[PDB]
A paper describes a structure:
The spike mediates [name]-[name]-2 entry into human cells, induces humans’ neutralizing immune responses, and is the basis of current COVID-19 mRNA vaccines. The spike on mature virions is a clove-shaped homotrimer (i.e., its pre-fusion structure), with three receptor-binding S1 subunits sitting on top of a trimeric membrane-fusion S2 stalk. Each S1 subunit contains a receptor-binding domain (RBD) and an N-terminal domain (NTD). The RBD is present in two different conformations: standing up for receptor binding and lying down for immune evasion.
We also determined the cryo-EM structure of the prototypic spike ectodomain (Wuhan strain plus the D614G mutation). As a control, we also prepared a prototypic spike ectodomain (Wuhan strain plus D614G mutation) in a similar way. As a comparison, for the prototypic spike, 50.3% of the spike particles were in the one RBD-up open conformation based on a 3.2 Å map, and 49.7% of the spike particles were in the closed conformation based on a 3.0 Å map. Sodium dodecyl sulfate polyacrylamide gel electrophoresis of the two purified recombinant spikes showed that almost all of the omicron spike molecules and about half of the prototypic spike molecules had been cleaved by furin, suggesting that the furin motif in the recombinant omicron spike ectodomains is more efficient than that in the prototypic spike ectodomain. Compared to the prototypic open spike, the omicron open spike had significantly increased buried interface between the lying-down RBDs and their neighboring NTD and between the S1 subunits and their neighboring S2. Structural overlay of the omicron open spike and prototypic open spike revealed that compared to the prototypic open spike, the NTD and the SD1 of the omicron open spike both shifted towards the neighboring S1 subunit. Moreover, a partially disordered loop (i.e., loop 853 ) in S2 of the prototypic open spike becomes structurally ordered in the omicron open spike, mediating contacts between S1 and S2. As a result, the omicron spike has a stable open conformation, in contrast to the loose packing and mixed conformations of the prototypic spike.
Residue numbers in the entry:
A (entry chain A): 508 to 622, 633 to 655
B (entry chain A): 311 to 458
C (entry chain C): 409 to 507
D (entry chain B): 14 to 69, 77 to 244, 254 to 310
E (entry chain B): 952 to 1001
Write the structure that this text describes.
Amino acid sequence: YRVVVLSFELLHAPATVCGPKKSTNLVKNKCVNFNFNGLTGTGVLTESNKKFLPFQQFGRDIADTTDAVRDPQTLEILDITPCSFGGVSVITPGTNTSNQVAVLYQGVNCTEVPVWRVYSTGSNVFQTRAGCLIGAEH
Amino acid sequence: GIYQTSNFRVQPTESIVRFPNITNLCPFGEVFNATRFASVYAWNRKRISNCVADYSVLYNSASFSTFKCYGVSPTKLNDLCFTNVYADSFVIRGDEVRQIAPGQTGKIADYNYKLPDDFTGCVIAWNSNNLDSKVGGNYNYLYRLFRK
Amino acid sequence: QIAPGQTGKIADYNYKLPDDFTGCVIAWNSNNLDSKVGGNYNYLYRLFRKSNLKPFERDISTEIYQAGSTPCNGVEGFNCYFPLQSYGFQPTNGVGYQP
Amino acid sequence: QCVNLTTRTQLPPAYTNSFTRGVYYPDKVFRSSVLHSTQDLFLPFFSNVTWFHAIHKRFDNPVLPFNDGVYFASTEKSNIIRGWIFGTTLDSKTQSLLIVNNATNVVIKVCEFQFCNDPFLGVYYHKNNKSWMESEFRVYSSANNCTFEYVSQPFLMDLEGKQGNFKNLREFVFKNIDGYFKIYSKHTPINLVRDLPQGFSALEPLVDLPIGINITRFQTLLALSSSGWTAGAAAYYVGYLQPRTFLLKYNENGTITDAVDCALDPLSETKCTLKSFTVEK
Amino acid sequence: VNQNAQALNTLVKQLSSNFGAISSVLNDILSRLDPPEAEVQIDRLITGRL
Ligand SMILES: *[C@@H]1O[C@H](CO)[C@@H](O)[C@H](O)[C@H]1NC(C)=O
Ligand SMILES: *[C@@H]1O[C@H](CO)[C@@H](O)[C@H](O)[C@H]1NC(C)=O
Ligand SMILES: *[C@@H]1O[C@H](CO)[C@@H](O)[C@H](O)[C@H]1NC(C)=O
């Protein structure tokens, strides 16, 4: 019987053989949560034009927030943008007059409003500089 | 009037992960599938370091008579990683494969090769009768029977 | 491993205490009462599980466990075990190993 | 084999003023049109660095310490400096580390040697073949224990050259932090006689190694029967790093253009506290 | 304008401090400890940010 004994050790010195890394495909233009070489984040990725130096990997901002990354497998630059958020506002005349209301999604381009639902495509979607107004007529 | 409620968020959909184009494997073929190994009294020692180890292809293989690990669960070896690797290769009797466990007794476990009480590692053994056995008896393989 | 939040085989696979526990624990040795030199293998514990179980949950299923990647059927097979395992309860053992 | 060469003239140690040199990229981030304040091991501005040179009659290769990294500069031609040794004792009382740039390969390894007093490499000169042939390799006397080794691809590097002014301005900075040996480097074309110039240029990273041993001393290896020789004109300079705080200016392309030392003189301290390069009345 | 920009800037900048915990990234505390210990760290973080 031919026998072999492995006599490795754990967690006391800088590792030299590790091995276990696997990668999926790359997507674009939808808010996804990503992990680039231990850089964990969430946002939407786009094609950029920033000019990294050969030895640089990340990119940071004035407030020290990452906003650009380099794809490890193919050397290209990706720009990171957080996906949208905001508050919701209800415009109402008093309940003494009517039970009808309008809704304002402020600071959102309502090409993606849907993500109660009836007031998400109800009777109009009117775009104003303050956001998207639903339920009121221009 | 106008009132405020209910902040909202776009709620990301799918996940993604990337890592470097890892390609530098460890030469396991030179320690597992070598033409001839050493005897138990002179168990050969080979060091592996600075490479990529893939334990899946060896754990799923069933041709091995025994694959007993003690310091790590078999599935976790492909999720943790190490500082040094050393392989001790030898050949023994089919009936003494149970003595190689740490802390046991017997001629091999007490005269040739002992494993510490807190051994962290694994043992992989398989039968190779048709590889190095002859009708006349391959006496080149021998053990230790007498020791102080 | 009985105290809330602990980890290990018992606390992880068979008996789990919640983190907001409000109660007491009583434990005392019963070596001279239920330990036999032959071995009281009536006492079994679970060694393997697909995942940990919820607090104050009780598992009694005896379906065989699969360790390796390959699937298994029947009653026994390689790297596919009956998860239950019995203690070696004898009075001769050292401290702790007694019931 | 290793013998002592003593045919030299004697001079006292020389010092020189390092105006603005020895700035490297502390990390791998990218920035554009920004002023960032960093704390790290740098070479203080307008410091005095030790100066060694090999001329004609001089052969100077002593053992010097290695604490918190070092800035090693060389104004050279003909590639006369080749090697570097490191270790706590350099005498097989403890582990030892070796870097060499041979005429064929570049070799790196950690083992347990026993270095002579004056190890060196020796290249023969114009022995009827017009090819300075390297034949003397006297670094250690043995190699007992090894835990890691490596050797790169063979290549060809010329072992000949004579200029009235040194052309290669090679700057290197080495550090050893928590078991990682880090090497930053940069190369520059210069036309200067016997000094390190005035100017600004940053040092990119080149290598990281996971060695993990204690390093306290180092020594250089120089390119040269058992007595008598000829060393090409060359000069190297040594300076030491200290923990300081700098203000670094990144331009549009993310390449460092200028720096300010926040402990030299009060005006620089004011600049540093306002985070700008111009201060109003 | 200057004062407003500066106040907002420092607000954003206070998100990369420790306040005594192990790390300033919540995901690293969560993905390195057990829930009976990560709590004592997350509490420090939320206190500081509040
Ligand atoms: C207002 O009148 C203009 C024509 O001057 C027309 O184009 C526009 O659609 C009108 N707006 C609304 C809300 O009816
Ligand atoms: C540096 O060395 C030179 C050598 O002449 C000396 O004049 C100068 O005072 C020294 N400066 C410091 C700060 O040691
Ligand atoms: C920055 O790099 C671009 C090319 O990548 C070059 O055209 C430009 O001149 C550089 N910046 C400056 C200030 O020259």
